[PDB]
Amino acid sequence: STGSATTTPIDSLDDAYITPVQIGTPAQTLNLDFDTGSSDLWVFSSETTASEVDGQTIYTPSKSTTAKLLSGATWSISYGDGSSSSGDVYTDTVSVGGLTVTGQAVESAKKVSSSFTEDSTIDGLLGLAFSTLNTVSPTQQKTFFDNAKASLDSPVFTADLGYHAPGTYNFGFIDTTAYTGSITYTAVSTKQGFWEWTSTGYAVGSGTFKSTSIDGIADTGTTLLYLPATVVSAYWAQVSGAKSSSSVGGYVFPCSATLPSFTFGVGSARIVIPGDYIDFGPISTGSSSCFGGIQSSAGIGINIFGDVALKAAFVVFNGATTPTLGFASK
Numbered sequence: 001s002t003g004s005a006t007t008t009p010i011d012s013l014d015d016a017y018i019t020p021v022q023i024g025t026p027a028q029t030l031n032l033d034f035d036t037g038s039s040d041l042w043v044f045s046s047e048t049t050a051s052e053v054d055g056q057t058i059y060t061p062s063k064s065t066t067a068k069l070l071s072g073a074t075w076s077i078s079y080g081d082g083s084s085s086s087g088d089v090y091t092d093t094v095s096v097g098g099l100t101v102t103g104q105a106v107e108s109a110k111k112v113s114s115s116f117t118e119d120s121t122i123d124g125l126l127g128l129a130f131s132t133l134n135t136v137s138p139t140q141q142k143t144f145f146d147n148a149k150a151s152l153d154s155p156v157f158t159a160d161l162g163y164h165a166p167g168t169y170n171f172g173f174i175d176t177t178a179y180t181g182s183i184t185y186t187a188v189s190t191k192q193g194f195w196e197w198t199s200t201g202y203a204v205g206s207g208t209f210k211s212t213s214i215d216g217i218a219d220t221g222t223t224l225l226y227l228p229a230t231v232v233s234a235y236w237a238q239v240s241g242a243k244s245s246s247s248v249g250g251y252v253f254p255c256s257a258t259l260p261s262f263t264f265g266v267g268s269a270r271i272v273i274p275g276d277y278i279d280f281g282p283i284s285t286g287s288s289s290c291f292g293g294i295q296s297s298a299g300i301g302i303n304i305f306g307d308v309a310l311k312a313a314f315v316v317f318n319g320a321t322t323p324t325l326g327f328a329s330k
């Protein structure tokens, strides 16, 4: 089997991407944030505290003839940005782009943090990291991809995120028309539960490539590119007037600037992020200070190849017995 679903930016800044997901019988379609940095499929629901729901579409398990309460199961998750959610668990039929999993754990939120409430465009998350990170207790549950894997034509999914445009998540096949050149594959460590890999270096604009190992994670659920402070400083030094602002929370730059590209290495291959992809717009409405798309990871503990980096590539998440990642230009 295969599946293919269009993923759409939630706003004009590509803050995140939403993909429609069918849950239950009859189907209830929710728009979920596919997140290769986590491993829970959780949704706003009829059980979510009413004051914490503000415009999201909810899953109502009582209206699904295939929903079953997973007795005794609870979940609770905290994300790298400080947001969180928790609740109980159903199993139900879940379909993405024509690919159907029966008995998928659907984690129903009883509580969500304010950032989730305040964002009406995201109805939940669909985790695509390794199932070892799943938070369901006392019996950990498998991701959608883990449940589908054995049925897929090939045990892979691909992320093809758009810049200011729609894009595609495919399951079970590699669309050879969706990229240019070849796909370069690189080793993955699953020891932390992430799609963790080592970039071979970087360049700023037309500058020389610096060969240096940068360990990080491929994370579709993170908006920006988080890299070591040395790398980030070298990038922003090429933008007149750019500076790190402690009050804003990162590097800002004059909105009148033209940003240089940023290149990262994948083996001997190179993925070029155009300068425009690094512009996150005024820090507040009407400001002439703009927030940068490349930021320091120093306060995270890991480097994160988020959407800024991934949307410059066609990315293969190869879930073979020994997982690997693939990157192609497009």
Ligand SMILES: CC[C@@H](N)c1ccccc1O
Residues within 6 Å of the ligand: 006, 007, 162, 165, 166, 167, 168
């Ligand atoms: C918007 C870019 C375009 N290549 C595309 C993206 C997603 C789905 C269909 C399409 O025609």
Ligand SMILES: CC[C@@H](N)c1ccccc1O
Residues within 6 Å of the ligand: 013, 015, 223, 224, 280, 281, 282, 283, 284, 290, 291
């Ligand atoms: C000024 C941009 C700011 N709202 C932002 C900061 C980090 C990640 C995404 C974002 O859009």
